[PDB]
RNA sequence: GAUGGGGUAGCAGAACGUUGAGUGAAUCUUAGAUUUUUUUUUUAUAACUAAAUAUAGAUGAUAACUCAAGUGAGAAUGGU
């Protein structure tokens, strides 16, 4: 999403979208510029190695 | 009229105009032997700052 | 210079051969014209296309800024008695654009998604057949009327650039022969 | 009243009055490590020195290019470029390939259709059914 | 860094100079090939050909720049074509003459002669660039050469208020092509119609400079052969530079001036009248003599086209394809000069 | 056909009869006037200067007229005094004394009445508007054929037709 | 050499005086109707020629202007005209593959053909003055 | 290539030729003596000449793909010349793919319903290449029964004399003599 | 899609839509889409 | 003696000296990868 | 100014490509190694030039010669 958001800010210029006012991403359910509790607290179990 | 060419087994044959006729082929291990204009020749032509064409021809 | 919004709808419980006809109906129409056709259609998926077209319009107005120039355009037409722009779409329909910021449905295509489910068809002779329940989506590309006023000026310039029709054209002779035939 | 047009210029015909070799540069890429560059290395030491002296109107640039096959890249006056991979070729095969780039032009290859290409009008003009003796059906 | 040593040994004070040094031209492979491509004589050193490639926009100094060579070259190119055009077509109208001088020695054709020599331009002028590249500054607005034409007192009115200029004063007041005289940095931009002009100007000045160097080193006769081989060898259809307004009226003034009997349009042949694409062939006859013939779809257009073909035949009269030039006399002893034809002028009519 | 060589044979056209009379012995220069349109570089003998030495006899001599189409006649029926009346009437009542009324009164060509006199600006601008209002009643199909007539005329005078 | 006919000696100036001239040169027996400036692309690779070489063409079947045509019985005499060309290098074609195959037979045999062609430029075509001859 | 470079406007123009089916044709007649026995061009020999004109195969720029044909106005087709007993014994057939719907008609009866022009078109039709240019070319064959037709102004002229008229050849030669008086 | 309960993110995009259309706020290009060093 | 890199070509043309100014004025990395480090979002989650 | 030129069954010669292996603790890579694409060129089942997108310092790719085969598919009412 950052690979495509940077190409639009380069191309659109003064027409750059306001992505902060957009709806959530239904894949993960996150807002723009926000992590998920599982990824912000790093609570995912890791292997012993 | 033929233009300068490099023959692999003979050498560098110079330009010849059969209208005024001379296939001179110069071979060697140095650029001077080949008969072409080398870098040193361009330095001798660049230092000749006195050469000037006659006023009548200018 | 030209704003654009690509919106992909949610997974609709229908097929591509059914919804394809609902995307060809709203193609080229303005969002207001396209919503009036979904409100009065008899198709069950026209109610879903009316909800997804209201979401895309909200994204265009908020995220992309489209459709936000009305008040300013209404002045020139009335306050100054200006002559609006008259264009002709690629299909040939003549339009009269008074507000160049009006949103419309530039492009639209339907794709097929995952398999909703699987039904079993129990025929005679103990035969069973699998019936795949389809889900499908639609994409709408929303643009402002400035895109149609630019595309019309290009088609008009390409028509005035091909030159006029001459009575006796200088057609080429495409056979070369090493002699004269006349 | 005669008004002169100012949107037509003279067209050049290379070969008439003066000739200009279309090949203006030749890039010679070799590799000291690649085994496929064994012949290209022998061409640069025995055949290139004299071939480069026979064509003083061509810019020869010899640069290494490890981990890559050897190529002969000729740049032409029309802006196009032709590259030839000379992997596993003997020194005398490279000299035959460098003569292909020198005699060639930057244009794209095209099938043989018509020998003559002329931009000058017919000495005897194109036929007309109105400038002859007539015809009776 | 240590892994990438510089390819070209240069002093530290080399990226700041306006143009490469003279001694730099003695180690570049582009010049040595460019010198050998044009078959220039060994009289012209490589330090001189390099100066021809440095435009006055990249270097303000009078030396190291094309300003002086490009002047001496423009005078020779213009003079040799002017005399050759008047000897070949002695009756060309003056406006067409300006168009034909501009069609050979103008910025447009001279830009193609430089691109046919394999001359690559430098991105931005600097002392680091190799002298074999044409280097100029396309963002500098005020760069121009010195010309013999003078500025018109009414120049502002002509442009703003569409005043009339004329075609008899252009010879003295205007330039050799009839045109009026005097008509940090950020590289985040695109091309401009003004920069394209500077690109055309830089190429033209270079081709003119090469002729200025040939004249200085090799003499006059060498320059004439270079112009005759590279410039005059180009082909142009002068019949396509003609634009007629009321040709039938002009043709009538011609016959009246030359005392020829009045012209009469006669229908030589025709077919397909009352059709979509008829053909009418009308011939304009002065007495029994046939001046010109034209075929068109409309009867009126056929009469107009026939009148143009008769006028083109009058103006495009050529004594010969390779006529003698007055410049052939000042050289080594040649045959005595024979007076060349001098036409009265193009007909002025209603 | 199958191959390009087979196509060249089916599309063959033989050269002109004149070229097929090859001389068996020696070289001969023959007269072969072609059935084509001559260019403008074949200056007619009437346009050659007397100085030019190439004015030979017809090549035919080295081995009625067609129907009239446009033969105009110029007439001068308006005296200097009558040119002042034209300038008075035109400037007095430009709607009654048009160039057609004055042309018929003085037996002149309509163009001449405009050469000696010009209507007031108000009247001139009124004429361009009438024709401008007439150019708005044309549909897209007639307005495109009316523009082609104006381009074919400018092309004709540029040597493009 | 054989003296030229008197009829060709009196009409050659009338032929050289006209505006344009063409010729039919014969390279190895094949004709090519050309004019000064034309670009002949021969269907073969002339051996032993490099770009810049000048060729003098001496086998011309026809030399004519608009109205006049000079024909030689086998060929026109070389003394009358002077035609010269210049070798502009050689060009090639895009590789074309011919697939020789028979029905109900899987073996498809390929033939790869990519020929080279020499390109010329007629830079001189003039008719000589034979008043002295 | 120079032979084709130029203005080919008039080489592609459509010329309106004219021939009368009643005038004796010395070239297209099989009886060449005596002068009074010379007959007009027969149906199939007049049709083979017309088909050549419709295809433009008489021009030096002919190309089968390019439609460079000309017009041919045939008058006096009521007096179409035929040999033997074709007129009353030649049959023209026709079928519409329905068994039993076979139509037969003789030349004399087809010359009564649709005149002699229909018999000429059926002959010229079978002599043209069977392709998408067939109906364009055949439509340029304008055949009439009498001496009247609407193309009396389209017929190609030379100095005011229609080709085929009494003195057109002298008018053509008088214009070529005026052409040679130039460089 | 017509039956999904509108979430908090869909209710805030409808209040902004009525604020831009009404004219209260003026739309401006986004400034946090990506942190580029060019800033153009 | 060494391989000609896209950097070497630009220096010959003269464009490089201008690129160093623009990249330096924008705080971008001339001939390097800067002080920024490798992507660690997936590495921090325990990716293997 | 060498001779020769269709081909089934069939016989024979010479090569390319795929996978793995040795030389290899080798060579090359943010000055872009690698990117199923597009493009260019070269007598070309192959490689190469350039372009566009992404971003790797080796669990990456790789010339040349060699070694071993689970090595080449429009055809089996073939199988998934
Ligand atoms: Mg059961
Ligand atoms: Mg057939
Ligand atoms: Mg055989
Ligand atoms: Mg065999
Ligand atoms: Mg890739
Ligand atoms: Mg299978």
From Swiss-Prot, chain D:
Keywords: Mitochondrion, Ribonucleoprotein, Ribosomal protein. One of its GO terms (molecular function) is structural constituent of ribosome. It is found in: Mitochondrion. One of its GO terms (biological process) is mitochondrial translation. SUPFAM superfamilies: Thioredoxin-like. Pfam families: L51_S25_CI-B8. The keyword Transmembrane helix does not apply. GO terms for cellular component: mitochondrial large ribosomal subunit. SMART domains: L51_S25_CI-B8. It comes from the Eukaryota. InterPro entries: Ribosomal_mL43 (IPR039927), Ribosomal_mL43/mS25/NADH_DH (IPR007741), Thioredoxin-like_sf (IPR036249). PANTHER family: 39S RIBOSOMAL PROTEIN L43, LARGE RIBOSOMAL SUBUNIT PROTEIN ML43. Belongs to the mitochondrion-specific ribosomal protein mL43 family. Component of the mitochondrial ribosome (mitoribosome), a dedicated translation machinery responsible for the synthesis of mitochondrial genome-encoded proteins, including at least some of the essential transmembrane subunits of the mitochondrial respiratory chain. The mitoribosomes are attached to the mitochondrial inner membrane and translation products are cotranslationally integrated into the membrane. Component of the mitochondrial large ribosomal subunit (mt-LSU). Mature N.crassa 74S mitochondrial ribosomes consist of a small (37S) and a large (54S) subunit. The 37S small subunit contains a 16S ribosomal RNA (16S mt-rRNA) and 32 different proteins. The 54S large subunit contains a 23S rRNA (23S mt-rRNA) and 42 different proteins. This is Large ribosomal subunit protein mL43. The gene is mrpl51.
Curated annotation (Swiss-Prot), chain F:
Its main location: mitochondrion. GO terms for molecular function: structural constituent of ribosome. It is found in: Mitochondrion. One of its GO terms (cellular component) is mitochondrial large ribosomal subunit. Coiled coil: none annotated. Disulfide bonds: none annotated. Keywords: Mitochondrion, Ribonucleoprotein, Ribosomal protein. It comes from the Eukaryota. Component of the mitochondrial ribosome (mitoribosome), a dedicated translation machinery responsible for the synthesis of mitochondrial genome-encoded proteins, including at least some of the essential transmembrane subunits of the mitochondrial respiratory chain. The mitoribosomes are attached to the mitochondrial inner membrane and translation products are cotranslationally integrated into the membrane. Component of the mitochondrial large ribosomal subunit (mt-LSU). Mature N.crassa 74S mitochondrial ribosomes consist of a small (37S) and a large (54S) subunit. The 37S small subunit contains a 16S ribosomal RNA (16S mt-rRNA) and 32 different proteins. The 54S large subunit contains a 23S rRNA (23S mt-rRNA) and 42 different proteins. Belongs to the mitochondrion-specific ribosomal protein mL58 family. This is Large ribosomal subunit protein mL58. The chain holds residues 41 to 225 of 225 of the full protein.
UniProtKB/Swiss-Prot annotation, chain H:
It comes from the Eukaryota. GO terms for biological process: negative regulation of translation; translation. GO terms for cellular component: mitochondrial large ribosomal subunit; ribosome. The keyword Ribosomal protein applies. Its main location: mitochondrion. It is found in: Mitochondrion. GO terms for molecular function: mRNA binding; structural constituent of ribosome. InterPro entries: Ribosomal_uL13, Ribosomal_uL13_bac-type, Ribosomal_uL13_sf. Keywords: Mitochondrion, Ribonucleoprotein, Ribosomal protein. Belongs to the universal ribosomal protein uL13 family. Component of the mitochondrial ribosome (mitoribosome), a dedicated translation machinery responsible for the synthesis of mitochondrial genome-encoded proteins, including at least some of the essential transmembrane subunits of the mitochondrial respiratory chain. The mitoribosomes are attached to the mitochondrial inner membrane and translation products are cotranslationally integrated into the membrane. HAMAP family: Ribosomal_uL13. Component of the mitochondrial large ribosomal subunit (mt-LSU). Mature N.crassa 74S mitochondrial ribosomes consist of a small (37S) and a large (54S) subunit. The 37S small subunit contains a 16S ribosomal RNA (16S mt-rRNA) and 32 different proteins. The 54S large subunit contains a 23S rRNA (23S mt-rRNA) and 42 different proteins. PANTHER family: LARGE RIBOSOMAL SUBUNIT PROTEIN UL13M, RIBOSOMAL PROTEIN L13. NCBIfam families: rplM_bact. This is Large ribosomal subunit protein uL13m.
Swiss-Prot record, chain J:
This is Large ribosomal subunit protein mL50. Component of the mitochondrial large ribosomal subunit (mt-LSU). Mature N.crassa 74S mitochondrial ribosomes consist of a small (37S) and a large (54S) subunit. The 37S small subunit contains a 16S ribosomal RNA (16S mt-rRNA) and 32 different proteins. The 54S large subunit contains a 23S rRNA (23S mt-rRNA) and 42 different proteins. It comes from the Eukaryota. It is found in: Mitochondrion. Belongs to the mitochondrion-specific ribosomal protein mL50 family. The gene is mrpl13. It comes from Neurospora crassa (strain ATCC 24698 / 74-OR23-1A / CBS 708.71 / DSM 1257 / FGSC 987). Component of the mitochondrial ribosome (mitoribosome), a dedicated translation machinery responsible for the synthesis of mitochondrial genome-encoded proteins, including at least some of the essential transmembrane subunits of the mitochondrial respiratory chain. The mitoribosomes are attached to the mitochondrial inner membrane and translation products are cotranslationally integrated into the membrane.
């Amino acid at each position: 999403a950052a690979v495509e958001a940077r190409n639009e800010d380069w191309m659109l210029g003064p027409l750059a979208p306001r992505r902060e006012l957009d709806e959530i991403t239904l894949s993960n359910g996150n807002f723009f510029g926000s992590l998920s509790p599982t990824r912000a607290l790093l609570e995912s179990e890791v292997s012993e190695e | 009229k033929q233009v300068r060419r490099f023959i692999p087994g003979v050498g560098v044959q110079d330009e010849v105009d059969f209208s005024k006729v001379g296939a001179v082929v110069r071979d060697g291990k140095r650029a001077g032997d080949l008969g072409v204009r080398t870098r040193s020749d361009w330095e001798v032509i660049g230092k000749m700052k006195s050469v000037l064409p006659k006023v009548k021809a200018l | 210079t030209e704003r654009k919004l690509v919106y992909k709808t949610g997974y609709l419980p229908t097929s591509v051969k059914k919804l394809v006809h609902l995307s060809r109906q709203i193609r080229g129409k303005t969002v207001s014209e396209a919503l009036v056709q979904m409100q009065f259609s008899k198709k069950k998926m026209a109610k879903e296309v009316k909800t997804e077209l209201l979401r895309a319009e909200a994204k265009a107005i908020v995220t992309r800024g489209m459709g936000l120039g009305k008040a300013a355009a209404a002045a020139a037409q009335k306050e100054t008695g200006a002559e609006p722009v008259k264009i002709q779409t690629k299909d040939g329909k003549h339009l009269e654009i008074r507000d160049p910021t009006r949103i419309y449905v530039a492009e639209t295509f339907v794709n097929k998604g995952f398999t909703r489910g699987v039904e079993l068809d129990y025929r005679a002779r103990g035969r069973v057949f699998k019936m795949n329940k389809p889900t499908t989506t639609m994409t709408v590309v929303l643009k402002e009327e400035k895109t149609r006023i630019r595309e019309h000026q290009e088609r008009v310039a390409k028509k005035l650039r091909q030159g006029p029709w001459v009575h006796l054209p200088d057609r080429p002779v495409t056979s070369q022969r090493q002699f004269y035939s006349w | 009243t005669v008004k002169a047009l100012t949107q037509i210029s003279s067209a050049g015909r290379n070969g008439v009055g003066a000739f200009v070799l279309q090949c203006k540069k030749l890039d010679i890429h070799y590799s000291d490590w690649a085994g496929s560059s064994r012949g290209m290395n022998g061409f640069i030491k025995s055949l290139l020195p004299k071939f480069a002296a026979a064509n003083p109107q061509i810019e020869f640039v010899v640069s290494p290019r490890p981990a890559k096959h050897p190529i002969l890249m000729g740049h032409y006056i029309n802006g196009r470029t032709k590259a030839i991979c000379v992997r596993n070729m003997e020194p005398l095969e490279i000299l035959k390939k460098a003569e292909l780039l020198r005699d060639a032009s930057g244009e794209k290859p095209q099938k043989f259709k018509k020998p003559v290409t002329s931009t000058n009008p017919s000495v005897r003009g194109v036929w007309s059914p109105y400038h002859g003796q007539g015809m009776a059906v | 860094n240590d892994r990438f040593p510089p390819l070209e040994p240069l002093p530290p004070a080399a990226e700041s100079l306006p143009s490469p040094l003279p001694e730099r031209a003695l180690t570049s492979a582009k010049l040595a090939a460019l010198h050998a491509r044009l078959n220039l004589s060994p009289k012209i050193p490589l330090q001189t050909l390099a100066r021809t490639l440095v435009d006055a926009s990249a270097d303000e100094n009078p030396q190291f720049n094309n300003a002086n060579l490009a002047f001496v070259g423009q005078t020779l190119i213009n003079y040799h074509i002017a005399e050759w055009l008047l000897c070949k077509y002695p009756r060309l109208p003056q406006g067409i003459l300006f168009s034909a001088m501009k069609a050979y020695a103008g910025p447009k054709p001279l830009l193609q002669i430089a691109r046919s020599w394999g001359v690559d331009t430098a991105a931005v002028p600097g002392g680091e660039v190799d002298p074999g590249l044409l280097q100029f500054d396309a963002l500098k607005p005020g760069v121009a050469i010195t010309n013999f034409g003078y500025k018109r007192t009414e120049l502002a009115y002509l442009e703003k208020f569409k005043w009339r200029r004329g075609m008899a004063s252009r010879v003295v007041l205007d330039d050799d092509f009839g045109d009026v005289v005097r008509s940090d940095v950020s590289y985040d931009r695109y091309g401009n119609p003004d920069t394209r002009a500077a690109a055309e100007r830089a190429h033209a000045y270079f081709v003119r400079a090469v002729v200025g160097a040939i004249y200085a080193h090799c003499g006059r006769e060498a320059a004439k052969a270079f112009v005759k081989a590279h410039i005059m060898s180009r082909t142009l259809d002068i019949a396509k530079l003609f634009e007629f307004k009321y040709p039938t009226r002009e043709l009538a003034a011609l016959c009246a001036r030359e005392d020829f009997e009045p012209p009469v349009a006669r229908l030589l042949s025709e077919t397909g009248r009352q059709s979509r694409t008829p053909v009418f062939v009308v011939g304009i006859y002065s007495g029994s003599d046939k001046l010109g013939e034209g075929a068109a779809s409309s009867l009126d257009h056929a009469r107009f086209k026939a009148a143009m073909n008769a006028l083109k035949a009058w103006y495009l009269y050529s004594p010969g394809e390779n006529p003698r030039v007055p410049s052939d006399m000042l050289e080594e002893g040649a045959k005595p000069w024979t007076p060349a034809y001098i036409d009265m002028g193009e007909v002025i009519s209603r | 056909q199958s191959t390009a060589n087979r196509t060249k044979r089916m599309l063959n056209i033989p050269p002109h009869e004149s070229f097929l009379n090859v001389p068996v012995e020696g070289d001969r220069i023959i007269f072969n006037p072609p059935s084509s349109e001559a260019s403008v570089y074949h200056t007619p003998f009437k346009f050659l200067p007397r100085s030019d030495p190439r004015r030979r006899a017809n090549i035919y001599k080295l081995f009625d007229l067609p129907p009239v189409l446009y033969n105009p006649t110029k007439s001068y029926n308006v005296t200097p005094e009558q040119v002042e009346e034209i300038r008075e009437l035109r400037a007095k009542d430009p709607k009654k004394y048009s160039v057609t009324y004055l042309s018929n009164k003085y037996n002149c060509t309509k163009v001449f009445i405009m050469m000696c006199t010009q209507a007031p600006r108000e009247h001139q601008e009124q004429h361009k508007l009438a024709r401008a209002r007439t150019a708005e009643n044309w549909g897209p199909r007639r307005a495109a054929a009316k523009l082609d007539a104006r381009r074919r005329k400018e092309m004709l005078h540029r040597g493009e037709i | 050499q054989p003296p030229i006919s008197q009829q060709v000696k009196e009409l050659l100036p009338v032929l050289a005086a006209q505006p344009g001239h063409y010729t039919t040169i014969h390279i190895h027996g094949k004709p090519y109707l050309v004019t000064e400036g034309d670009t002949v692309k021969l269907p073969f690779k002339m051996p032993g020629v490099a770009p810049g070489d000048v060729l003098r063409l001496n086998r011309a079947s026809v030399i004519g202007s608009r109205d006049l045509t000079l024909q030689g019985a086998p060929y026109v005499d070389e003394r009358l005209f002077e035609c010269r060309a210049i070798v502009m290098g050689t060009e090639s074609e895009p590789m074309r593959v011919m697939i020789k195959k028979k029905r109900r037979c899987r073996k498809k045999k390929h033939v790869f053909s990519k020929h080279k062609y020499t390109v010329l430029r007629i830079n001189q075509l003039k008719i000589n003055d034979v008043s002295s001859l | 290539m120079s032979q084709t470079v130029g203005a080919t406007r008039l080489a592609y123009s459509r010329v309106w030729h004219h021939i009368s089916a009643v005038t004796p044709h010395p070239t297209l007649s099989t009886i060449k003596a005596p002068s009074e026995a010379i007959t007009p061009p027969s149906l199939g020999r007049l049709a083979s000449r017309i088909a050549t004109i419709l295809m433009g195969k008489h021009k030096p720029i002919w190309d089968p793909s390019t439609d460079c044909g000309d017009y041919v106005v045939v008058t006096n087709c009521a007096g179409l010349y035929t040999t033997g007993h074709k007129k009353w014994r030649k049959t023209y057939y026709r079928h519409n793919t329905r068994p039993g719907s076979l139509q037969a008609i003789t030349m004399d009866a087809l010359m009564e319903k649709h005149g002699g022009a229909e018999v000429l078109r059926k002959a010229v039709s079978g002599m043209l290449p069977k392709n998408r240019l067939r109906d364009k070319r055949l439509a340029r064959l304008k055949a009439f029964e009498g001496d009247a037709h609407p193309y009396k102004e389209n017929l190609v002229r030379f100095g005011g004399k229609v080709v085929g008229a009494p003195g057109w050849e002298e008018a053509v030669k008088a214009i070529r003599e005026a052409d040679m008086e130039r460089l | 899609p017509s039956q999904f309960e509108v979430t908090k993110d869909r209710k805030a995009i409808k209040a902004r839509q009525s604020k831009f259309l009404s004219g209260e706020e003026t739309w401006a290009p986004g400034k946090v889409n990506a942190f580029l060093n060019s800033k153009i | 003696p060494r391989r000609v890199t896209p950097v070497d070509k630009e220096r010959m043309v003269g464009r490089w000296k201008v690129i160093q100014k623009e990249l330096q004025k924008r705080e971008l990395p001339v001939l390097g990868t800067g002080n920024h480090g490798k992507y660690v979002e997936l590495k921090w989650l325990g990716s293997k």
